[PDB]
Amino acid sequence: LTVQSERAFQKQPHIFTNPKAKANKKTKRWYKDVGLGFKTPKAAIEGSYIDKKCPFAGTVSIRGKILTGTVVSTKMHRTIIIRRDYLHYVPKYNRYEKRHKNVAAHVSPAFRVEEGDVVTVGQCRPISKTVRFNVLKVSAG
Amino acid sequence: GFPMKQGVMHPTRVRLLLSKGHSCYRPRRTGERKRKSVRGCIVAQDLSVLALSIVKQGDNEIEGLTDTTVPKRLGPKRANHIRKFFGLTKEDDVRDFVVRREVTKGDKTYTKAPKIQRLVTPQTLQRKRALKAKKVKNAQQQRDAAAEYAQLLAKRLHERKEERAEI
């Protein structure tokens, strides 16, 4: 697994490592905290992956709704699907029925998720046809 | 009756999409375009009328065409147009050179003359002075409001310097 696996060089935009510099030849890395009390995983501060859609190493911003669900599919590259279960109230019968909605979310390489885990996703700008949420925290299941 | 359009190299009629600025068309609203049939620019036997301009006068006078003349309806109106028309200098006074056409209303006749455009007048210079004086006054009001803010910031910063020194 290598970062430079594409036909184009993968790098963070406008983050310049001057070749004519001192001996501390460490590639300058940019990162941010997303706010809302979410901790930045150290795989982002210290990693080398490039992901423009990562909340911590990319240019996306977290704003809007924060959702939680159970991961049911990790078969896409950098994209997972979580399943959200809820109870719908039926007023006529004074009872409930089980319902579910599937939300597609982007997962950054800073996280490792398998099928069955419970993750917390925050809303972001549309980053795909079906993806509007982006993983902010992972809880093993 | 279809008119001839310049550049259509045909002796017959064609239909074009005419727009603003095209001859043979007058747009009813802004940005409007109409498809109109127009006659080509090549003369043939299918013309009902041909328009001609005399370039060089011939041998014999034409009965109603080359002997008489009609004066131009309007004289120059812009100041510089009057100056170009008959030797004025930029220092000459155009005011007593406008041609006035006099109208006869029954018994008393008076003259009517155009209002000269682009004429420099004390009101025009007054407006130039007002604009430049206002620009300077604005610039001073901004640079002394900025200077006053610099005083306010310097006062606050010095006060915070002593606040840190106390703490």
Add this chain to the structure above:
Amino acid sequence: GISRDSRHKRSATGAKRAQFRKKRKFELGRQPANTKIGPKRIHSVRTRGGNQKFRALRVETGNFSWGSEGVSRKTRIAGVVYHPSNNELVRTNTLTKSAVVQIDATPFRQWYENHSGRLYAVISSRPGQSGRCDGYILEGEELAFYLRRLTA
């Protein structure tokens, strides 16, 4: 007219979406410029809100910046030599973003003196948006990756 709306597409579950409304102007699209190399020719396009965009149909020179020295000079470009999207653009010399081009080295050489005659560059401007082919000079690992890809 070319549009960007997702109405023409089908849903994620695969359902063929029906005809909701006619196409709207506030989602239109236009043709790619396909910037070439030739006498500088730009066309301005009337966009939404009164803004104006400049199709770079063909260009000759654009400003390029040496990141190590912080110097930007206007210099000639030879042609595009590497494009991650399509190799047809490399073959036909189409100038788009993220495309590796070769630039004339005379201004950078003269600045270096005052302080193979063609230097590699990556266009960072969008000629089909602004009409300028502005880019930077490859250095370091980016340079190494692109040179490995070019030589093979």
Add this chain to the structure above:
Amino acid sequence: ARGPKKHLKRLAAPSHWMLDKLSGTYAPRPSAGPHKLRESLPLVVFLRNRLKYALNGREVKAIMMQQHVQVDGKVRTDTTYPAGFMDVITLEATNEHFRLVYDVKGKFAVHRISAEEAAYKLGKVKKVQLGKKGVPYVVTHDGRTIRYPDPLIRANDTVKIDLATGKIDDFIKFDTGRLVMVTGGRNLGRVGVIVHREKHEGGFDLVHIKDALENTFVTRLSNVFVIGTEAGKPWVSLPKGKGIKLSISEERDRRRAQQG
């Protein structure tokens, strides 16, 4: 639909204008201006429906075309000018000065003030940020932009604008114990002091406000307008009733005693 709307149906007008159902099909659509559409009062409504100086729109147009009406020290001839919260309207021909302050019942009270008080107004600071040439500026609730503010000024504070030069006379910091009027919600028009501010990052901050009758209510921070440095010391004259909310039974008792 294809562009901005220019009409307002009478039934769709804001309820605090107190327009009648059967007077017509349409209501005055307020123009663009310093105040938002829903939180404003057009001058045609103020001059005809509230004061009843003009009997109809021809008369309000004749009045405003004779240059009588001034809002915040400038002559307005737009019959649909969107007058709003805290604006001062002066009619020196009749020698009358009004201030638009909400009463506790949720409507704009007809609150007359002296010319000396009509010489200024208050504005809530919405944002502080840097303008061109690195010059900071403040945006108040009525869309005003004041350059070179006091470096201590932050968001949610209230400044007192001289209203003749457009400069800042002085300001009030947002803090516990400040006098506040509510400018939104069902508590519109109420006045009280801040007791405790409860923050919610990523959401809407909530402010706990205590009435003069020791009634406590909660409202969003966006509906809070600081009007005084402490309890009983407002920077503007309050409307009749002093912003104290009475129950419906208490109001019924008061009206019965007042009318006999």
Add this chain to the structure above:
RNA sequence: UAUCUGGUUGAUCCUGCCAGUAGUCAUAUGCUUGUCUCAAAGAUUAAGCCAUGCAUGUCUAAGUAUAAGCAAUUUAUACAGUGAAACUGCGAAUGGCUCAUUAAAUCAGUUAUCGUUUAUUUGAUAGUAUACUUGGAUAACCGUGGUAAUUCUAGAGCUAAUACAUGCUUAAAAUCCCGACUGUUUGGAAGGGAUGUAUUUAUUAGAUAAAAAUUUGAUGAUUCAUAAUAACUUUUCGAAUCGCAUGGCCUUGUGCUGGCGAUGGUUCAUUCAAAUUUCUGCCCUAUCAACUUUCGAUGGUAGGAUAGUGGCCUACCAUGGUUUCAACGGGUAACGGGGAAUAAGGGUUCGAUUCCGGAGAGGGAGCCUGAGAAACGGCUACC
């Protein structure tokens, strides 16, 4: 008013339906019809077809007036009052109508734009390194017309602008680059260029855990605001405009200065908006169980296009995405909602229709202008 009664038997008690009964913002129809107030009305069938007329135009002291228009001689021989026609500006994208399509589509409540465009209104904001003020067209107008016919227009002769195309006028410093000479312990320098604002790149500030051996804004969050450096640009605009008053200083000049206003202008903010967008919620049907992915279906990388996000499109690469918790398909005598009728409670039925949102102008499709239209009382083409 939380109600029942007649009908199967020779007679009985039941199940059970038929029938009776009352309302309907529920339509039609018959007979009949004196008064006051209020008031629906070609939705249902045919989003079937249309004669005719009207429904969108518009001028203030303040854009352009030689109407050969009217009026009077008057503070006026450049015009000056009033005022057709035209050019210019703005509006014509509002309103009004209808409900064909449309079943996660529209819509409702709740969210987001740190993902964008925004005429206008309202605040701020621009001294930037021939001037007593630049050009040449054109309309109306005059007079030659062609066609049976249209809100068709062509030749010829004029003339104007806040129309079109161009252009100076100015503070004081200060800073940066190149740099002849010079000082010669690394300084001083003549002379050349550059400074406002927009565009496009690249690179730097943009800080903020508490003692020992000088500045630095906001946010929950940013590569935000903003500043600086090196350049770039078929070089954006920093008023060649218009009305009323006519004042002040004398070194007796058409001298120098200046008051209230019209309109316009760059950027930021505001407002009127627009466009996408999070969550949850739609009627009948399984005699609809698998659907989507050639020729985008799900995702990754790069680009193009857009006002902007986004398979919106392209190239390459993976095989993904939805579904018995009903996907997909079909039907709807289906616009959604606020609401309406009846109702002890729970419910059942209706909602074309006075308000909000959406869509359409015979059916499609494509566009110009404009801030705003895929507009139809705008155009182009087909049926």
Add this chain to the structure above:
RNA sequence: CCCGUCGCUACUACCGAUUGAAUGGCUUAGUGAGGCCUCCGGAUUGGUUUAGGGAACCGA
């Protein structure tokens, strides 16, 4: 009391040769109006404008 063939009359639906017929929606393939972008093109029409007969060369 009652069941059913068969016969007569009337009505409703079903099957049925006719590769039956008609109407509407979606679509493969072929042809393809029109607009838009691009590429040249350059009727005529102004002069960067220069010329003792005037030869040019710039823009739209």
Add this chain to the structure above:
RNA sequence: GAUAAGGGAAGUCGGCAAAAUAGAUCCGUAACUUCGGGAUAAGGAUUGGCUCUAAGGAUCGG
């Protein structure tokens, strides 16, 4: 043994004789069925030359 305007089986017992189709790649493919077939069903698109690009392997060297 060839070709033929317009029509296209009206010729003849009868489409006899001739014509038309035809390789390959890709798409699409009905009734019926003994479930194996029918099937190359039917019905469409492409195909030259040149200049390139990409993929598919072997043997040595730790």
